Curated annotation (Swiss-Prot), chains A, B:
It comes from the Bacteria. The keyword Transmembrane applies. GO terms for biological process: proteolysis; toxin biosynthetic process. Disulfide bonds join 44-225. Keywords: Autocatalytic cleavage, Disulfide bond, Hydrolase, Membrane, Protease, Transmembrane, Transmembrane helix. This is Serine protease MT3772. It is found in: Membrane. GO terms for molecular function: serine-type endopeptidase activity. The keyword Phosphoprotein does not apply. GO terms for cellular component: membrane. Belongs to the peptidase S1C family. It comes from Mycobacterium tuberculosis (strain CDC 1551 / Oshkosh).
């Protein structure tokens, strides 16, 4: 008889994030390029709020689920609204790119190399659709994560992610995980259900393919409401 | 005490469709402009097949649910495949428009006036992804139908539809309901669940708004897999 429990390796244990990261000079320097996204989604009977960041002039990256099902997307930078168009939308990888004419802040650069276990990193975003907040974090591990896409479609997806030790909050989706150099390590998208202090981040490598469509100008749809 | 059953008016009873409609000269004349659609949908672990029809040179109308979740759409006319691009996709009304370069058959015209109860009409399409089939039909009523969109999103939709007396088959979705003049009265999309010989057709008026995007050229997404 082979016994039939299911087991998996735990998320890599790492030290508590350094609380002082909230005051690291990288936070204030990066903040202008981290934007709030508000999406009206009457089909879903919701207003969605999340975070994005500038990837090139007039181009903002966020998660697909931050705009899924919506019919109007506004980007806020420096407490000012900017009209946005969804020009790339990928519910499998979970990334959207927005065209945002005349958006003042400069782009952030994706980090050239992967982060290492135990590294000090920072989640930047807008919890609750409120004020900009830096959330101290620590890298646990780069993993290949398999699971459903944002719609729960039949065929699962496999993506390169970081697990992090952090308290990721609703509204942080779409924001960057930055290193202490102010470069983007990935896009924060989720939190563990059962593992309280664990967040999930799409790696820079995982989202890189989306940039092939950065030159798009026409609106693409925003798909179904997330269940 | 007010009693609490639910009641509704029955679909309008009408005579059985005239079986001779399969041989009406309008069928053969319209057939070249009624195309088969095959959509590869690996996200949904399915191949989807339905029907569409030419609405303007190199432009085909079908239902959104005929291409929902797919990543490749082929149009077949005269037993030949044509590459297609989804350039408009509306899961609320349930209509997609395909750009189909160098598609030989001519367009069909939308009928200028609504059909009347009892009118002889014909459902044209490709049941089971097989051979072209004309299905005799009879108009029951033009109604305003409320219900969920194709994804079961929270907010219901209200659409102008015909109910018809007909045996609508899987694969007929997206095909035209034609009058005896060979003009398009609407787009066949569904069948009653409990009322066996009843089909549902989006009216010409209901789908007319989609034509505002007929000049689109860039691909839009195909949304979520229908559950």
């Amino acid at each position: 008889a082979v016994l039939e429990p299911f087991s998996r390796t735990p998320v890599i244990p790492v030290a508590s994030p350094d609380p002082a990261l909230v005051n690291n000079p990288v936070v204030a320097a990066t903040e202008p390029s981290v934007v709030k996204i508000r999406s009206l989604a009457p089909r879903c009977q919701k207003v969605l709020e999340g975070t994005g960041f500038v990837i090139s002039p007039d181009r903002v990256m966020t998660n697909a689920h931050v705009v899924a099902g919506s019919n109007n997307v506004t980007v806020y930078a420096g407490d000012k609204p900017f009209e946005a168009t969804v020009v790339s939308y990928d519910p499998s990888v979970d990334v959207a790119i927005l065209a945002v004419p005349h958006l003042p802040p400069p782009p952030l650069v994706f980090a050239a190399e992967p982060a290492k276990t135990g590294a000090d990193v920072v989640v930047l975003g807008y919890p609750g659709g409120g004020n900009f907040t830096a959330t101290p974090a620590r890298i646990r591990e780069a993993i290949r994560l398999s699971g459903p896409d944002i719609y729960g479609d039949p065929e699962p997806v496999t993506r390169d992610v970081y697990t992090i030790r952090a308290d990721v909050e609703q509204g942080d989706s779409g924001g960057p995980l930055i290193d202490l150099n102010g470069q983007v390590l990935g896009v924060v998208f989720g939190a563990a259900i059962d593992d309280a202090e664990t967040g999930f981040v799409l790696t820079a490598g995982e989202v890189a393919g989306q940039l092939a469509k950065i030159g798009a100008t026409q609106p693409v749809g925003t798909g179904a409401c997330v269940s």
